Every structure is written in C-alpha cells, then in structure tokens.
Amino acid sequence: NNPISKTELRELVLSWQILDAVSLALEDKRALFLILELAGEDDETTRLRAFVALGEILKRADSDLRMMVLERHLDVFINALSQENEKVTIKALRALGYLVKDVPMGSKTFLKAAKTLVSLLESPDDMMRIETIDVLSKLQPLEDSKLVRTYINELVVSPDLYTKVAGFCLFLNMLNSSADSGHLTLILDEIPSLLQNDNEFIVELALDVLEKALSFPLLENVKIELLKISRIVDGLVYREGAPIIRLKAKKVSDLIDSVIS
C-alpha cells in the first residue's frame, strides 16, 4: 500500500478538510492513530483541529471502535483537559463525550477520568462547565463497587454546587451497573437542595435520579425522608417554567406513592 502519511493528515486537519481526514480515519485505523498523535502535539492549532477531527470521527464510530480507542488512548484526551488552554479543552471534551458514550469503564480509569473532569469545574468559564458536566453525564462505570460509590458519595456531599451536580450525574449512570439497589441513602439528604434549585438543568437531574433510584426495591426505612421529598416534588408539579419538570414531577410523585404506599 501507499497510505496517507502523517504530514499529509496534519495538513488535511489544519486545512479544515475535516471530512476527508474523518473518512480516512474511519476507513483505516492507522490514520486514526496518526490523528491521535496530532492531538498530542505541542502546537495549539494542531491540537484544536485534531480534536475537532476526533469528535467528527468518534461521533460516527461504532461502539467496538470506541472501546478500543478508549482502552489504548484515553490519556490523549485526559492530558489535553486543562483550564489553561480552554479552547483546546472544549474540543477535547466534545470528542471525549462521543468516545465514552455507553462504554462501561473499569473503576480505575473511571476514577481517573472523573477526577480530571471534576477538576475543570474550578474554572468560572460557562462553556467549560457545560461541556464538562456533559461528559460527566455520559461517563459510565462498569461496577457499582464500594470504590465507585465512595467516590460518588464524596462528590455529592461537597458544598460546591457543580461538584455535587457531577456527583448526581455519575450516580445516575452508576445505577445502570447496579443489580438490585437504588442506593437511596447515598443521595437522599442532598437531593432536596437540587430539587429546590433555581436552575432547571439541576432540578431535572434530581428528578431523573429519583425516577431511576425508585425503580429498585427499597430496603431502607427512609419514609420520613421521602415524605419531605414528596412535598417538594408535589410543589414541582406546579412549577412555572419548562413543562418537562412538571411532567417528571408527576411521574416521580406516582413513583414515590408506589414505593411509599
């Protein structure tokens, strides 16, 4: 063969001939690996454009290809996540979001990615916060082990709002890996704060967490806690704003009733 070269892909990427480079990397892993290299080069423009290409590739890539990139090259994405190079970080975040979508992660890499992501929440930049939370909302642990739960509990007890939101995002995903428990004790005392938040993304997140968590049998006596939560949710049924909150409040309210008959 006479395949496309490294220098050739960089020029393609820099020229914003993105779909060409995307087509080539999807057709042949060698080219994808070379774009991963560009994504680690010292030049900012190169890194930015390579992450753009990576995002367009990964949004198109099947689950098998993404697992492979994830197992071998997670560090390419992780190392480019920094508050100091914001523009590159945003593109890396977008590409990371497509990569990890529906890909269960061993607890070791899960924790390393999650911790790097949570670190970015120090930044005041609104776009960075949005993209960071978006990746966290997609980050899926393979296990509901004590390790994973302990980390998530640590986040949800944080007095910092978006650290707690991160916690709730991860908790939601962790319930996909739980066989029999909704681990309601993990979040019960912190969730009224999110339900009673002014921000609509945060309220909906809390409602989503309740809906999933209440689908599991309730082994703990948290009747007093769910009552107080039920009052808040009853209120939310009539909350001015987005209708989906009112709707999800009804569904959670019916859920709580079925659990707390």
From TrEMBL:
Among InterPro entries, the record links this protein to: ARM-like (IPR011989), ARM-type_fold (IPR016024)
Q: Domain of life of the organism in this record?
A: Archaea
Cite the SUPFAM superfamilies for this sequence.
ARM repeat
What is this protein's record name? HEAT repeat domain-containing protein
